[PDB]
């Protein structure tokens, strides 16, 4: 049990670290998805707004 605990603790710590890595990667995806949407629909949708004007004339 001491080893099972160290192992479970390694697993708990692993999961805390894995969660930490994923806390970081979820935030990176939360920020990257955010940034990509924020820049991508905001720019390309803006480019389609610009289409409204670009294709006028």
């Amino acid at each position: 049990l001491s080893d099972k605990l160290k192992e479970a603790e390694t697993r708990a710590e692993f999961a805390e670290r894995s969660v930490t890595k994923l806390e970081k990667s979820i935030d990176d995806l939360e920020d990257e998805l955010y940034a990509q949407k924020l820049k991508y629909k905001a720019i390309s949708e803006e480019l389609d707004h610009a289409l409204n004007d670009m294709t006028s004339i």
Binding site: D27, L33, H49
Partner: protein, 64 residues
Amino acid sequence: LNELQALIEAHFENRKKEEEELVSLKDRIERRRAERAEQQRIRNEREKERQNGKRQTEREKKKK
């Protein structure tokens, strides 16, 4: 022309208004994510709180 102008205005309004809806709400989602993550961080803080010579003498001589 009624068909083209009507459809492209439907495009503008409906779709991009909708796109900003998406922007807003997805931002809400991400904010939820980050705030709840930080809250877990503070929880972990609290829980781990629950889980809890001779040279000196001669120097003193000379310096004093």
